[PDB]
Design a binder for this molecule. Structure first.
Ligand SMILES: CO[C@H]1/C=C/CCN(C)C(=O)C[C@](O)(C(=O)NS(=O)(=O)N(C)C)c2ccc3c(c2)N(C[C@@H]2CC[C@H]21)C[C@@]1(CCCc2cc(Cl)ccc21)CO3
Length: 155
């Protein structure tokens, strides 16, 4: 399952990088160039989403009350409720992942760093297993990269 593997890698790295503030230096697995550009896009676009919706993000985090492993495991049901049961576009996928990074940073702050990789798996499961058809039709991570590609300005 190349799409799942690639998705997990991109999401995991972003969540870890967001939580730790440090870049993972290991190479990507398969489809390295796309996965690298995908991660770079998420850095650009995801950070803005978290700031543009700061207050709503804080409010949802406070409402969820995430303390431990069992609370983190309960999030997949909420993700299916909010994300899966609605229209699909790249914007809503960025929000799924950006709120994930927001939860990841919270987990670091309460010393629950070990729950981050499970969280990343849960997000990936929801994204890939409920939206595979849409993702394939939109060209997967190549389509993601192409969608958010910004052309250089004329100097
Ligand atoms: C009102 O607060 C919202 C913020 C909305 C601003 C962004 N916006 C305009 C959206 O439309 C985001 C949205 O696509 C969405 O549908 N939001 S909404 O249902 O609440 N409503 C249409 C605004 C949208 C798309 C995808 C979302 C999602 C919202 N979640 C709820 C967001 C996090 C703060 C909640 C967050 C959520 C659901 C909550 C649990 C969770 C946990 C993880 Cl680890 C990752 C994601 C999520 C599902 O992912």
């Amino acid at each position: 399952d190349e799409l799942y593997r690639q998705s997990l890698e991109i999401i995991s790295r972003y969540l870890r990088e967001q939580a730790t503030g440090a870049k993972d230096t290991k190479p990507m697995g398969r489809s390295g160039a796309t996965s690298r550009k995908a991660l770079e896009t998420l850095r650009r676009v995801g950070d803005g989403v978290q700031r543009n919706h700061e207050t709503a993000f804080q409010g949802m985090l406070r409402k969820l009350d995430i303390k431990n492993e069992d609370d983190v495991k309960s999030l997949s049901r909420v993700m299916i409720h909010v994300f899966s049961d609605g229209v699909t576009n790249w914007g809503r996928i960025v929000t799924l992942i950006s709120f994930g990074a927001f939860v990841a940073k919270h987990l670091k702050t309460i010393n629950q760093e070990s729950c981050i990789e499970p969280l990343a798996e849960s997000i990936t499961d929801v994204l890939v297993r409920t939206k595979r058809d849409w993702l394939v039709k939109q060209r997967g991570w190549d389509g993601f990269v192409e969608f958010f590609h910004v052309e250089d300005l004329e100097g």
